[PDB]
Amino acid sequence: FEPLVRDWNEFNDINKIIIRQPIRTEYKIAFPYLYNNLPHHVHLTWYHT
Amino acid sequence: MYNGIGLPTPRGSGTNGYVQRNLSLVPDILDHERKRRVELRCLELEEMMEEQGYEEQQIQEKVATFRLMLLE
Amino acid sequence: TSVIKIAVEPVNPSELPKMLDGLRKVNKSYPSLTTKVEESGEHVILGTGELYLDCVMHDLRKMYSEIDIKVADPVVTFCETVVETSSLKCFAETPNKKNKITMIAEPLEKGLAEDIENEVVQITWNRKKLGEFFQTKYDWDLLAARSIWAFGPDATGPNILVDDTLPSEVDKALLGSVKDSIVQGFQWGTREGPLCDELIRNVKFKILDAVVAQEPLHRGGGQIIPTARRVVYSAFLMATPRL
Amino acid sequence: PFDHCSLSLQPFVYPVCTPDGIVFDLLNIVPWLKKYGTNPSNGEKLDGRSLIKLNFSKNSEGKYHCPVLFTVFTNNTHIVAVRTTGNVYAYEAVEQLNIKAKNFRDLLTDEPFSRQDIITLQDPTN
Amino acid sequence: ASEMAGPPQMPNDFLSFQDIATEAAHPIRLFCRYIDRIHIFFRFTADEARDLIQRYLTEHPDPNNENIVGYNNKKCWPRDARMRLMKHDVNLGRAVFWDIKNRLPRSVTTVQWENSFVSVYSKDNPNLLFNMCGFECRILPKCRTSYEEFTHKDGVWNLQNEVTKERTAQCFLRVDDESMQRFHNRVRQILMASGSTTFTKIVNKWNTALIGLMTYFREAVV
Amino acid sequence: WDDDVVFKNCAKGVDDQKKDKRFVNDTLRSEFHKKFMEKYIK
Amino acid sequence: PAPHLAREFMIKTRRRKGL
Amino acid sequence: CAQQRTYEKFFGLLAGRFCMLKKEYMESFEGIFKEQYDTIHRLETNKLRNVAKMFAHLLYTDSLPWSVLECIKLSEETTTSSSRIFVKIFFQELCEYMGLPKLNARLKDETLQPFFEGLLPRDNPRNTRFAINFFTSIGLGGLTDELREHLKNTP
């Protein structure tokens, strides 16, 4: 769909990151509050039925 | 999987917006140790002696011969 | 044990107090949630798994604090240990060169360290029962057991502090005096770690030669602790740290 | 940073701590007062004799490490020093050897100090 | 100016000096003036930089450390590649600029901080960025943070040390945002002014615009 | 160096000239118009 | 790859907090 | 690459990517240098120059093994003038890229003696002389002298 809406940072310093497994869109959607900055109008998927 | 690629809408690009992956992608330690080895031997000898005779002369006699034997 | 580690920081640095109120609120709601403040500016959250942290940040962002927060990607917390026995003595004499401590270190066998973690051999025993347990369970030496001074980082920690220097060990006067701060420096070095500043695991320390200032006054008292800490780190490092 | 002056903003040769908290190297700050009795840290004029020294150790590499714990100093580390002493230690060691105890003395010498004589010259948490 | 221009009997050429001594005898080492744009390259010692920053802070006192706010670095390179704003660097930038702008009577001409751009190469800043005719260039030595060295597509020039004939730095080239916007507007008026040309003429103008761009920039385009 | 330079500091008390805060009720002599004109004409 | 995750983790953790 | 008007590193880097993906390109490129050199006399000097540059690029990117210089048995008889211009352009190029120092280190490391044999030929004094003089005329005086030092001390 079209995007719902459309500076510096110190966390993002790549020399500080431990990259083991690349974070994919499935992960960012499964855990939308942990892998996501600025989640607005996000519904929380989970099921283990 | 949309991983930060392609237009958020392929509207105003003049393309279809297809994305494929890049297919062409790829001796003081020695001295210390020696002293302790005799020291451990000294403690074991002294206790062994007291258990097999705590008559202090008995302990000193067994420990002294043991310490001398070890040092030699 | 919560091992997953998540760093948090507001978008507008103006908003730090509201974020701190949020972290208080989430600490109140969650029983095992750990929070810390890393000197390097981080407010850090320790949890158990991805879903746990997800719902923590859910309660954070939506209800307790409606501030906007950036979240670093997770990592694990590590421990530090050795594979091998220390090869030489590095030894600290306190700033006023009055007391010298030589102490070397080695890896513990799993069985005990897991027993200490299980509280099987809790040191609130007397030395007798300690030795009984020890000589029985791990072919431990009995004078060793009598030399077993402490367990370190807190009330029960996998590490083990043991002194063996018999003839001058019979200076039990000033030894028995300073042993308290000796173990305080042991606990500090063990809670603080040399490699990553992480809790060290599964290590045996043996104090082999303690020269003490005669009447180890405030000299010994205050100055001995950092000396003991450097002793711990130096043995550890000197012959074989590991993650 | 830790090892940078303030009138110059470049590496400091002989550090001389101001009683307010800003380090400033005297090899510069001498002339700044000889031409303007005010300091650059505040245009409010101040004393020169108030300048305390600061003695910073060095490691096998020479980097300015704290005295007691031997932690190589960085740009985040909290560094406090004893004005009654003139030696600079890490805030952690200074506190948890003079806050855990009551012995508000020095830690490098037996110099007793006043519990107001610790000035924290650089601490990111502030 | 006379050391740069050399003696009237034996002038120098664009960026040359008659001797290493007279080259190093001053902070201004290179100077170029395109019709009214000015590019100067300064090289300061520690004490010269120190005197400058004093003489500037003396007369524009900055207590609350506001010198960092106004600065402009280039928002087109990565974050590893733009300027880092360390207090000494941003102060040396503004001191150099505040010094150059006092040499000009304000009634003759002036110089503006919002239209100027200053770049510092330090031990905190390894890249030297600049922006000449339409090109946006960034120079990176090899001794500095260049653990991995490479050749690459032709955006990269490998600069040669002429004495010893070996590569010491690389210049990375890009097209400037003003040039990109110029091209965009060129096409915008091709389209706007085309309900009065024939198809062949519309394509003739597209073709001219596009050769004009590609033949001038040529590897910055890529 | 710095000897052979003709004009010493030309800007001593240049301290910000509060027109950027005035409001002039005249369409062609306002700050907005002067900045607009200076930005768009050449 | 495997041989150096320990070097990588310790370096990264120190550059993160311990310096 | 060769038929173009002037060099650009595109074709070299593209072949380089292929040979850096699998070996068969490395094999075929050692063969390539062999036969290209042997039949170079047919190229007009622009294409000859472009081939020379191409091989210089490959060699200093180390996509080809430095062994391949085995082929230049640099007698006077065994080499046409065209082969000589190829060696001239090739070596100018290599020197202008890695510099005389790194070029010298490369040509002076031992394990490549067998392949650099005919290039630094000391067995027969006649081609030794001629080789040295050619190398000088083009301007590799350093390797020149080292070999003349050897030869003057040899008789």
PDB file of N, CA, C and O in Angstrom, chain E residues 189-202 205:
ATOM      1  N   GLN E 189      11.299  22.565 -18.265  1.00  0.00           N
ATOM      2  CA  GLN E 189      10.871  23.549 -19.245  1.00  0.00           C
ATOM      3  C   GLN E 189      10.845  22.979 -20.650  1.00  0.00           C
ATOM      4  O   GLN E 189      10.166  23.519 -21.520  1.00  0.00           O
ATOM      5  N   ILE E 190      11.549  21.878 -20.896  1.00  0.00           N
ATOM      6  CA  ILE E 190      11.311  21.139 -22.135  1.00  0.00           C
ATOM      7  C   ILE E 190       9.872  20.672 -22.193  1.00  0.00           C
ATOM      8  O   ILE E 190       9.216  20.772 -23.228  1.00  0.00           O
ATOM      9  N   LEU E 191       9.365  20.127 -21.091  1.00  0.00           N
ATOM     10  CA  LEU E 191       7.986  19.650 -21.081  1.00  0.00           C
ATOM     11  C   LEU E 191       7.014  20.807 -21.078  1.00  0.00           C
ATOM     12  O   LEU E 191       6.032  20.803 -21.814  1.00  0.00           O
ATOM     13  N   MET E 192       7.263  21.809 -20.246  1.00  0.00           N
ATOM     14  CA  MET E 192       6.359  22.944 -20.187  1.00  0.00           C
ATOM     15  C   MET E 192       6.243  23.625 -21.537  1.00  0.00           C
ATOM     16  O   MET E 192       5.152  23.993 -21.965  1.00  0.00           O
ATOM     17  N   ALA E 193       7.351  23.792 -22.233  1.00  0.00           N
ATOM     18  CA  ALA E 193       7.340  24.474 -23.515  1.00  0.00           C
ATOM     19  C   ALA E 193       7.126  23.548 -24.693  1.00  0.00           C
ATOM     20  O   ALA E 193       7.725  23.786 -25.739  1.00  0.00           O
ATOM     21  N   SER E 194       6.342  22.489 -24.563  1.00  0.00           N
ATOM     22  CA  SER E 194       6.189  21.507 -25.632  1.00  0.00           C
ATOM     23  C   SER E 194       4.727  21.182 -25.805  1.00  0.00           C
ATOM     24  O   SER E 194       4.261  20.133 -25.364  1.00  0.00           O
ATOM     25  N   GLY E 195       4.042  22.052 -26.514  1.00  0.00           N
ATOM     26  CA  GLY E 195       2.722  21.850 -27.050  1.00  0.00           C
ATOM     27  C   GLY E 195       2.781  22.762 -28.243  1.00  0.00           C
ATOM     28  O   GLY E 195       1.782  23.129 -28.862  1.00  0.00           O
ATOM     29  N   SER E 196       4.008  23.174 -28.513  1.00  0.00           N
ATOM     30  CA  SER E 196       4.353  24.056 -29.605  1.00  0.00           C
ATOM     31  C   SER E 196       5.597  23.591 -30.330  1.00  0.00           C
ATOM     32  O   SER E 196       6.119  24.317 -31.174  1.00  0.00           O
ATOM     33  N   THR E 197       6.121  22.428 -29.982  1.00  0.00           N
ATOM     34  CA  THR E 197       7.179  21.868 -30.791  1.00  0.00           C
ATOM     35  C   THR E 197       6.737  20.529 -31.344  1.00  0.00           C
ATOM     36  O   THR E 197       5.756  19.942 -30.905  1.00  0.00           O
ATOM     37  N   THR E 198       7.472  20.051 -32.332  1.00  0.00           N
ATOM     38  CA  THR E 198       7.177  18.757 -32.904  1.00  0.00           C
ATOM     39  C   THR E 198       7.875  17.676 -32.097  1.00  0.00           C
ATOM     40  O   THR E 198       8.728  17.958 -31.268  1.00  0.00           O
ATOM     41  N   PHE E 199       7.479  16.431 -32.304  1.00  0.00           N
ATOM     42  CA  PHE E 199       8.097  15.357 -31.548  1.00  0.00           C
ATOM     43  C   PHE E 199       9.593  15.300 -31.780  1.00  0.00           C
ATOM     44  O   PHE E 199      10.362  15.064 -30.847  1.00  0.00           O
ATOM     45  N   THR E 200      10.024  15.531 -33.010  1.00  0.00           N
ATOM     46  CA  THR E 200      11.441  15.476 -33.306  1.00  0.00           C
ATOM     47  C   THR E 200      12.184  16.559 -32.580  1.00  0.00           C
ATOM     48  O   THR E 200      13.310  16.349 -32.145  1.00  0.00           O
ATOM     49  N   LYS E 201      11.568  17.718 -32.423  1.00  0.00           N
ATOM     50  CA  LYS E 201      12.240  18.807 -31.744  1.00  0.00           C
ATOM     51  C   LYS E 201      12.260  18.604 -30.245  1.00  0.00           C
ATOM     52  O   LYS E 201      13.235  18.957 -29.586  1.00  0.00           O
ATOM     53  N   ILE E 202      11.196  18.049 -29.684  1.00  0.00           N
ATOM     54  CA  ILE E 202      11.198  17.723 -28.267  1.00  0.00           C
ATOM     55  C   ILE E 202      12.323  16.757 -27.962  1.00  0.00           C
ATOM     56  O   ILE E 202      13.018  16.875 -26.951  1.00  0.00           O
ATOM     57  N   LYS E 205      15.780  18.474 -28.096  1.00  0.00           N
ATOM     58  CA  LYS E 205      16.125  19.175 -26.861  1.00  0.00           C
ATOM     59  C   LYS E 205      16.438  18.225 -25.725  1.00  0.00           C
ATOM     60  O   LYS E 205      17.327  18.499 -24.922  1.00  0.00           O
TER      61      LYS E 205
END
